[PDB]
Write a protein that binds this ligand. Structure first.
Ligand SMILES: O=C1c2c(O)cc(O)cc2O[C@H](c2ccc(O)c(O)c2)[C@H]1O
Ligand SMILES: O=C1c2c(O)cc(O)cc2O[C@H](c2ccc(O)c(O)c2)[C@H]1O
Ligand SMILES: O=C1c2c(O)cc(O)cc2O[C@H](c2ccc(O)c(O)c2)[C@H]1O
Ligand SMILES: O=C1c2c(O)cc(O)cc2O[C@H](c2ccc(O)c(O)c2)[C@H]1O
Ligand SMILES: O=C1c2c(O)cc(O)cc2O[C@H](c2ccc(O)c(O)c2)[C@H]1O
Ligand SMILES: O=C1c2c(O)cc(O)cc2O[C@H](c2ccc(O)c(O)c2)[C@H]1O
Ligand SMILES: O=C1c2c(O)cc(O)cc2O[C@H](c2ccc(O)c(O)c2)[C@H]1O
Ligand SMILES: O=C1c2c(O)cc(O)cc2O[C@H](c2ccc(O)c(O)c2)[C@H]1O
Ligand SMILES: O=C1c2c(O)cc(O)cc2O[C@H](c2ccc(O)c(O)c2)[C@H]1O
Ligand SMILES: O=C1c2c(O)cc(O)cc2O[C@H](c2ccc(O)c(O)c2)[C@H]1O
Ligand SMILES: O=C1c2c(O)cc(O)cc2O[C@H](c2ccc(O)c(O)c2)[C@H]1O
Ligand SMILES: O=C1c2c(O)cc(O)cc2O[C@H](c2ccc(O)c(O)c2)[C@H]1O
Ligand SMILES: [Cl-]
Ligand SMILES: [Cl-]
Ligand SMILES: [Cl-]
Ligand SMILES: [Cl-]
Ligand SMILES: [Cl-]
Ligand SMILES: [Cl-]
Ligand SMILES: [Cl-]
Ligand SMILES: [Cl-]
Ligand SMILES: [Cl-]
Ligand SMILES: [Cl-]
Ligand SMILES: [Cl-]
Ligand SMILES: [Cl-]
Ligand SMILES: [Cl-]
Ligand SMILES: [Cl-]
Ligand SMILES: [Cl-]
Ligand SMILES: [Cl-]
Ligand SMILES: [Cl-]
Ligand SMILES: [Cl-]
Ligand SMILES: [K+]
Lengths: 259, 259, 260, 259, 259, 257
């Protein structure tokens, strides 16, 4: 019988690998994914939302920048409980979506990154007490997973002892938050999620490219420059606004077409 | 102090024993039951909905067909916890409602069937992977309880080894789902709930009447024909659509009268 | 340029000619019709609603009883203005729907699409003025009628109000009587009158609309032996509905969410 | 046939003549009036709202201060068109409500003031360009009607040439707005509606009592002090906030009771 | 990792120490507090609501009468879990609010009373089975905490064996409910919350002042008359209606200004 | 007294002249503009919506491509009636917004076009439903330069430009309405919506197929659309659906966690 109370926030990194796909992918998301999703998890998900990503910044490609959006669930139970595999109605999820997101080509293909977190950030490392009145945030959400055969403790150490200090040093960076990915849920390859706030694109660039040149290149690096990880495979990211109109449990009133 | 996290889906089988009662019963449900209900359980029920039943099919009477609707709650806690018996405001629930539903007459009445289930089906026995795009479903929801002094294991065996195979054999039947009733909650007499999908009434009839003639009549049978159980006492049912507008936690905006 | 302020209530009489069609028709209505409709007229329709019909009563067939629902719009402008024919996105409205509703017979003769325009308020209040909702639940029998070809409209009117209505007023089982004249100038609808006639329940309806109405003289233009003396689904349609619907679509619709 | 496009804002001044009545009156308003109202005018009213009145200030009684609320409609057509007298369902409006509001006593009662206006203010006389960011407003809405046999032109002149200048002189007064009442609609006795903003009660008092002592007492005065008009008969008023949660066409989800 | 399922109803007693503050405080609550709050706890709070308090009755000051409102949350988890201290965006909560509520004097200064309860009343002591149809309720919600060095068991005994019987004796009192405050959550000084229903203000007065004169004055009393406790410090209260339009999770559509 | 029933659809072409401005402009729109707007016109506007623009396509700059969104109102009355100038509460609309949109730095006009609520001309793709697939909806407005006969401009548009659209299978729809110049003296004359399947289709037709066009004598640039970007032409490409249907959807400026 028993089901465990397991309150979590999940993030899905939705890419769009080509502008010609964007209409079609966006359609599927707002016309199909939403109702199909709510139809299943309404009773045990307290918040379902999409945060469309800002235009990819210079060198965003190197950070596995998701060119469509972040998809964000708040669960009361583990969606990976085997018992939850059974659904009266199943979702309509064509191959094409995987093409559009870049999981498949038509190029090598790219994993589907679905990270589970506690509902609250584990580490507040810069900008505690910042209110919304303090101004609009360029919120750079980035997840990372250390390559195979790299001790996780060492990766952690690198992240917090070498990377974060650079963020703290930069006045252009207004906030730093981190949570450890719950690997015990769906075997997601990622280890950490961070959100790193700037004022704008230029701030992001200055810090995440230029300030990060100062970093020692680690021996396990999969690219020459920070983040030293394979785009879309061991790192994904998006820059998003403070607010989304796509708070789907409250806001969705059907797929009403423009006139 | 402590309250157990106990996520469940419940079903109430609401009959209407006479067309002359229908206006009055429907009024009570939508004018009174909804606000009275929400007023009590809003904070610990994630979904409250009514699925009005399709017109009773031929020989539906023999299946304890609920001629008004299904009432459907999703609980986060056991509503039968004794501590939940205390309410500031109590509901308005007159005798007349029980007359209308057939719990009372005006020479014997019919029990109130209130079945608690896990939030997800335990057994998927036909039609896995069916999406909503596959077409409109005549969803025949049926619950059953084996008569007194009938070994539950034998009843189970009969159901899955004799009844279900007939459902699987019939191309007219698109889906079969089952959960065991949680008897430990409110001593509901029912043992199983199934949902059995057809394309329409004629499909339902063909299978649930005609194909079921082939069944051996068991020694505990309370009627000659399948389902071999006492209508409204050891079997209730309803046929409903895939969709209801009465998703009460989202949709209810008062008892607005037509003009 | 100019567009006329033309506030109206319309009614569409949606039949379902067979129980095997009901799932499919209902699907189309709630999954497709709603979004397609709102997508077009949201800015100039103040209220869009469906009132599902109660189970067809005995001899309801003779009154063109719509076995699915009433569809109800409140317009700010005439939807039949020619300029409103142009739509960026068009609706998905397959033949099959017409089969299901009974406009087409599929593969004798089908049944017209009855789409009646009215003023937003009833023109005639003939019984039960001042009745509140506290007075109890209503079996609301909405019925529209059109007098056959070559029947003087004035005479039809006279018959309706001087012969039919008095029977309704005589019956204690009948709690309310309302009528409006159909706006024929809008979409050439064949109907002339819409009435709503309230009872307590089905039995009341039957007693009055069948039994009390036997007393009526059969008029010379009658298209059937018994009241309403008009061709089912062609010169008369009807539905019995509740006081309340959850399908108030402009407020309530949150997508086609499926049961679990 | 034809119906005139007649876009108007109306105000009803709802008093509560005794604290013992307040529960009962408030109940009727939110439990009964709202649904009954929407049930009638949903299709031709674009906004229906209640603005509960702040606690009656010192000497508010002399201004016909409505101790319950303002009721506010936005019409597309004249509700006094005779054709609109016909309604399928009628409202439940007991005598008691009139007692509670003070239309009836137990030694003389008070008229029901229902004033129709254009949807936009006709005169902006102080504080043009004030935004909501400029701070919270004590919004003193007051309507007045000159006694019988008082030339309307003279009344107008008095109002704008003697009264208003005092408002403009007072720094405590942040805003002044006025519209002429549409007398042609429902024969309302009132001639003008003004809204006069302060920072708070004390500001209101300073200006509307103390500064107004300087006013010449006119020969038609029905009381010694400004506003020189018979409370609740030739003057009503309320002080309200910038925002109400009772925006009934959007917000109402039934009469849900506290737990 | 693990987070405890901890379903609770909390109450905050919001005072307004001066009518000149009321506009400003009300503004902050509805313009700022709501969005700031929802922005944080939407996923783990099932109901967030304000119940504005009726006008302070005679001698209400002696009961720590909250002159603005009750603030009411329903939690799924303890908000005092240390891990919940971390928020991406923090709330805007100026000093001024504390002045307005009376926590600071800008007069002696008064604690912020934030009481956690089970979601259901622990004791039903009068009026069980009362429905909303039985009439409108003057709901007097009162919380109390016994002064320092007063045995809690004795306080309890006094409350239930001496105070409550007076409530039961009075036909003017329609309902009595009580829950023990969860002291283990946020060290709230209060021990009990009761709701005590009347028909109106006069009923309240008759019982809570006049009938309560009959009470023996205990040796620990901090004032001469019942409730024998220090206003706003060891007792707070409010009288509220059965219904509020400020059911914020459902109803809030922005801070829309009147016209 | 009397107010004229004047049902109209308006479009505002909201640019964002720099990515560094985008956070700030977007904030103002969703945090401030919405409530300020609804607070004023709720009773006489039936639909208020934002359609965020797709990423600017190649050579979009030449079409006055609005890099933030389209803003879309449906009015029951003329918002330019002088009597509607009076508001209890006024909007917060700082200079900075005009900088961000590009009205202020040469500087670019504020394009606010009023239309009938229904398209006047349906020139390709009549009867297309939403089931026919997702649309790249290229909304473009144009105004002929000063001293250019309007009749000739019209003729050019419908007899030379549109036929190229009709010829292209990549173009699924063509719609046009004449701008109501009598309302707010908007400089634009026409609004068209022109549908494609995607960006590449748009480009193929609106750049490559349009090379075939004779360059008119009044042209303000060498290539189609032959009009001054952001001044005599603005445009946006948008989706069939927006979540920002503000009268229904807005529940406050709730921040991500
Ligand atoms: O929005 C969603 C979404 C999406 O936007 C893009 C995508 O590529 C996959 C998706 O899948 C999400 C999902 C997660 C967990 C579930 O259990 C589920 O049924 C659906 C869905 O909600
Ligand atoms: O959780 C999952 C999921 C889901 O629950 C719901 C849903 O609507 C889509 C989904 O899509 C995920 C997926 C698809 C393709 C892949 O290649 C892959 O690795 C993962 C799957 O894992
Ligand atoms: O709280 C309750 C309730 C309610 O809140 C609202 C309402 O509209 C009906 C109700 O009735 C429920 C009920 C449960 C079991 C029974 O056997 C029964 O007869 C009634 C009761 O639990
Ligand atoms: O809709 C409802 C309902 C109904 O439709 C019909 C009916 O006969 C009883 C009902 O009672 C339901 C209920 C069950 C358990 C509870 O604990 C409760 O509070 C309410 C109520 O929700
Ligand atoms: O716009 C329309 C429309 C729509 O948008 C959506 C929808 O689901 C059905 C519809 O049906 C209407 C209709 C079609 C054909 C007729 O012959 C007729 O009288 C009415 C049509 O006008
Ligand atoms: O619900 C609706 C409906 C329906 O249920 C059944 C049906 O057979 C036709 C319908 O058509 C309605 C409609 C009428 C006029 C229009 O101009 C329009 O756009 C749509 C639609 O709204
Ligand atoms: O339709 C109306 C109405 C209503 O629909 C609902 C309701 O709750 C109250 C109402 O009261 C209004 C009214 C106006 C003037 C009066 O003098 C009076 O007694 C009542 C009336 O216009
Ligand atoms: O809120 C309302 C209201 C009220 O609060 C108090 C009151 O004393 C009368 C009222 O009557 C309003 C109303 C006015 C004109 C109408 O035509 C109508 O139908 C209703 C109603 O809406
Ligand atoms: O409405 C609210 C509120 C209020 O009205 C008045 C007040 O003086 C403080 C407040 O604070 C409440 C709150 C409690 C716990 C939290 O964790 C939180 O984030 C917010 C807030 O919801
Ligand atoms: O969690 C809390 C909280 C919060 O999260 C958000 C918010 O907007 C207000 C809040 O108010 C509470 C508070 C404020 C000041 C105090 O002096 C005090 O004792 C308590 C605090 O408990
Ligand atoms: O009321 C108005 C308004 C508003 O309420 C809210 C808002 O966010 C912007 C606004 O802007 C409108 C406007 C401003 C400047 C212009 O140059 C122009 O053409 C239009 C103004 O009319
Ligand atoms: O959202 C809107 C909007 C906008 O998004 C961007 C912008 O640059 C100006 C704007 O102004 C719109 C508006 C136009 C005319 C009015 O009279 C009014 O009150 C408001 C407003 O609604
Ligand atoms: Cl700001
Ligand atoms: Cl590299
Ligand atoms: Cl009873
Ligand atoms: Cl389909
Ligand atoms: Cl038995
Ligand atoms: Cl057994
Ligand atoms: Cl039998
Ligand atoms: Cl009743
Ligand atoms: Cl016959
Ligand atoms: Cl709405
Ligand atoms: Cl402020
Ligand atoms: Cl007089
Ligand atoms: Cl006097
Ligand atoms: Cl501060
Ligand atoms: Cl009552
Ligand atoms: Cl103490
Ligand atoms: Cl004392
Ligand atoms: Cl909601
Ligand atoms: K480096």
């Amino acid at each position: 019988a028993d089901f465990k109370f397991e309150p979590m926030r999940s993030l899905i990194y939705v890419d769009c690998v080509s502008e010609d796909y964007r209409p079609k992918l966006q359609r599927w998301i707002y016309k199909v994914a939403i109702p199909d999703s709510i139809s299943q998890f309404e009773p045990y998900v307290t918040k379902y939302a999409f945060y469309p990503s800002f235009p990819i910044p210079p060198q965003g490609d190197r950070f596995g920048y998701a060119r469509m959006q972040l998809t964000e669930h708040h669960w009361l139970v583990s969606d990976l409980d085997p018992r939850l595999e059974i659904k009266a109605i199943a979702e309509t999820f064509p191959m094409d979506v995987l093409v559009w997101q870049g999981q498949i080509p038509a190029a090598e293909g790219n994993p589907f990154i679905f990270a589970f977190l506690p509902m609250w950030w584990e580490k507040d490392l810069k900008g505690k007490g910042r209110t919304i009145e303090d101004g609009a945030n360029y919120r750079f959400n980035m997840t990372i997973g250390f390559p195979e055969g790299v001790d996780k403790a060492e990766g952690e150490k690198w992240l917090f002892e070498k990377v974060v200090p650079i963020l703290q040093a930069a006045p252009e960076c207004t906030r730093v938050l981190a949570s450890a990915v719950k690997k015990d849920i769906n075997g997601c390859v990622m280890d950490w999620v961070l959100e790193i706030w700037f004022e704008n694109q230029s701030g992001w660039y200055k810090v995440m490219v230029d300030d990060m040149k100062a970093l020692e290149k680690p021996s396990w690096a999969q690219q020459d420059a920070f983040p030293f990880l394979k785009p879309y495979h061991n790192v994904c990211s998006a820059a998003v606004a403070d607010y989304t109109p796509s708070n789907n449990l409250a806001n969705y009133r059907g797929y009403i077409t423009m006139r």
